[PDB]
Amino acid sequence: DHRKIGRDQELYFFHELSPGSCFFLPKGAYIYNALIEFIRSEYRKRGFQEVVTPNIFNSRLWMTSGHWQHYSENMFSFEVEKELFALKPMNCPGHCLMFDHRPRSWRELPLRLADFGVLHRNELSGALTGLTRVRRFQQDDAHIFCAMEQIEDEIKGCLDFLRTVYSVFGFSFKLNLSTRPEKFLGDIEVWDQAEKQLENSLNEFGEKWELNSGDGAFYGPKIDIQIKDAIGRYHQCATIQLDFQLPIRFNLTYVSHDGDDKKRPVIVHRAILGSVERMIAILTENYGGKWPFWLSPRQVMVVPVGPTCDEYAQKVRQQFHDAKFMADIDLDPGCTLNKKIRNAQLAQYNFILVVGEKEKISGTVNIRTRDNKVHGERTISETIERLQQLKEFRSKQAEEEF
Amino acid sequence: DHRKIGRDQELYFFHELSPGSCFFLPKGAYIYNALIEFIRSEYRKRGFQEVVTPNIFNSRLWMTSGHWQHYSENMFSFEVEKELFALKPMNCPGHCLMFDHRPRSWRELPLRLADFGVLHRNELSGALTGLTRVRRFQQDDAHIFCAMEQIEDEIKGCLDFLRTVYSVFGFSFKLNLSTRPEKFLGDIEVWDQAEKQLENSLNEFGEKWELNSGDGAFYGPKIDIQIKDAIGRYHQCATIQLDFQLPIRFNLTYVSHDGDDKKRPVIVHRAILGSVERMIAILTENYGGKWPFWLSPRQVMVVPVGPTCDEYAQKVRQQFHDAKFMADIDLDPGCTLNKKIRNAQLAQYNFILVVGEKEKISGTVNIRTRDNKVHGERTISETIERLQQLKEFRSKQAEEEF
Ligand SMILES: C[C@@H]1C[C@H](C)C[C@H](C)[C@@H](O)CC(=O)O[C@H]([C@@H]2CCC[C@H]2C(=O)O)C/C=C/C=C(\C#N)[C@H](O)[C@@H](C)C1
Ligand SMILES: C[C@@H]1C[C@H](C)C[C@H](C)[C@@H](O)CC(=O)O[C@H]([C@@H]2CCC[C@H]2C(=O)O)C/C=C/C=C(\C#N)[C@H](O)[C@@H](C)C1
Ligand SMILES: [Zn+2]
Ligand SMILES: [Zn+2]
């Protein structure tokens, strides 16, 4: 489904020379960068600070993190000057080094570090499918370093995030709490404070949530989120994961209000999209090829009524292109208006701007949609402004709200 | 000094667990993304199309491109499922695969594909210095696929690209043509057409250039370009490099206007900044920590006169942060106005917004620069507007031009 649309819409493809990795053609790449810019746009508002980290590390780091022990087979390892190195499966330890880079206080907390960095995980070749099961991807990854007392407040924020992002997509979602398992690490009082705060947040949030007892990780309790597509399928995407182990293994510390300087923070792993790749696949199948305007690789199709208008159509497009819209043009003299409009619709262009003598004289465009409805003849400036609003607010039906 | 400035400004650091790879703190990360965004802003105007490509490839690909026989000592390679894979030192072969993905025509040319993808090259620990000699970097990398006859024009565009970017940085620059070496591959006629067109555009560019004979690569002629910093030191960053070998090795063809489907295009490797890392090192060295407002990780410092205004100050600081600016705040009740201002000026904040009771009721701010010049009182909206104009135009002196 999403793969066939990927090839048909010239979004992305796969080659046997890099299994589990994807090739994004300029349009799919536009979608990639669009999603990332969305996440960042929310980061700037929510107090998340993006960082750039290394993609490879010495084996010792993975030894202290616990990957070399429990993840070793999923990691690509190689040798640099007789020392063991590996590509990062996760961004977490690198962020731990960043927190531990200098002394930190309680006034810095909560400290939220976001990373889009490239993750590699070694998946058996037989199990690889499309963008769903991959060896390479960029996850929208942030870690929250806070005090225990702050947890409840950070979680509710973390939920407010989800509900916002998904509400842009038009997804409905369900939540579930996985608590302390049989075998667990660290003191149980910490576990209890944490889980109490988690429950309080989930209840304050208002959504019906499920409790899976003992299904949490040994290093911390967790909230999992599943997304429901248009057809009603569920995909595990978002997660909120507490880690008490990581601060101990990297010996992480802040200076309390008190301030005792031996207090360790709590780590919160969170992702919302999952990975960009995964979100792209799911969205490609969910939208059925019809992309919302802000995500759309083909936003505008300028078509002339006749060759006489070929120049005007060139101007118009350029102007829309200078408005940061993805705007193409159909100049083929050997094809009819209706056929160009229809083909633009089959190619899933959100807006088709038809121009003719009347439009050339008045400096206007005749607005057609993908649906294909008529929005009449408007000035190019009016149209640009309206489209700009539809793009900025990420309207899911732009054509109807025009 | 760029290391010392990186640490003192809290930009980036290095760790023994990943030598040759850099850790970018939120400020350095801002600089990073700002540079990439600049290059993209110029890509959108010049007809460059960005793509996303895999970071690891099968040994077969590198044996096709020639990296296996040539660059293998600088490549990190590892075994997966009894097959050799490697991290990509360069983006080129993947782009060749993207060109070869479907049949193409003269109408599609020139086809300019840009890639910001992460590149690793294996450098000796002893050779590693800061951001200047690294194992990990993101190149601003583009490949132009054009017909031979188009070369002279494309090169011209390339130069115009070079001229624009550097002029934003305020960099003067040198140009040198390297031509066919004694040991060379490809037909000599092709070489002669290429070098002819290169000479022509270098001459129509109107800037003095040096001729280095036989100093070119075996696979093509090239134009190397060096930038001079404010101190008068030259750095090798930009390159335009022709490749006839890559199209042959990957068997790339397009359909000519005349109907011939057997014609190979010419590949043009181009990079303006070299690597983002490298450009960051050079700019850190060049500016002395005094960043142009658009590149500056510290844009705005909000200082309240007294506790009564601590509220208003945080609203201001918030609004500016929503406006996408980097805006900090100095709340310390134990410190005087003048030393908060002086310290902000020492920390190289471009603009210092002082906020009193008078400003709280008026919905205004009192503007002071890094150079300790007063712009007086302006509304928040006005200030945001002017600052945004100065940011969008990437002005070299924002403080003086406000
Ligand atoms: C090295 C250990 C392997 C662990 C047993 C892997 C499990 C399969 C599972 O626990 C992983 C997990 O849920 O990670 C989830 C991540 C978060 C988002 C998506 C999920 C993701 O990235 O897949 C987060 C956990 C990171 C955890 C650590 C780190 N560093 C732990 O301290 C460390 C003990 C993990
Ligand atoms: C495998 C070959 C290795 C070649 C001999 C390396 C030389 C040391 C040097 O010529 C590399 C070079 O100039 O690359 C320069 C790149 C371009 C900008 C920065 C520079 C950069 O990235 O450093 C570009 C060349 C890419 C070339 C190819 C590819 N693929 C060639 O077809 C292929 C034969 C390269
Ligand atoms: Zn994590
Ligand atoms: Zn190249």
Author numbering:
A (entry chain B), B (entry chain A): 322 to 723
Verbatim from the authors:
To elucidate the species-independent, full-spectrum inhibitory mechanism of BN, we co-crystallized a fragment of human ThrRS containing the essential catalytic domain and anticodon-binding domain (residues 322–723) with BN and determined the structure to a resolution of 2.6 Å. As a typical class II AARS21, human ThrRS forms a dimer through the catalytic domain, with each subunit binding one molecule of BN. The polyketide BN binds tightly in the aminoacylation active site cavity of human ThrRS, constituted by class II AARS signature motif 2 (residue 432–469), motif 3 (585–613)22 and surrounding hydrophobic loops 386–393, 411–413, 538–540 and 564–567. The plane of the 18-membered ring in BN fits perpendicularly to the seven-stranded β-sheet of the catalytic domain. For instance, Q460 on the floor of motif 2 in human ThrRS forms a key hydrogen bond with the only carboxylic group of BN. Notably, the carboxyl acid group on BN precludes a key interaction in aminoacylation by forming a bifurcated salt-bridge with R442. By interacting with the guanidine group of R442, BN prevents R442 binding to L-Thr and ATP, thereby blocking the formation of the threonyl-adenylate (Thr-AMP). C4–5 of BN further pushes Y392 into the tRNAThr A76 adenosine-binding pocket, whereas in the tRNA-bound structure of the E. coli ThrRS, the corresponding Y313 stacks with the adenine ring of A76 for aminoacylation. In our structures, a major feature of the BN-induced conformational change is a 14° rotation of the α helix comprised by residues 431–448 that produce a 10-Å displacement of the preceding loop. This structural change is observed in both the human and E. coli ThrRS–BN complexes.
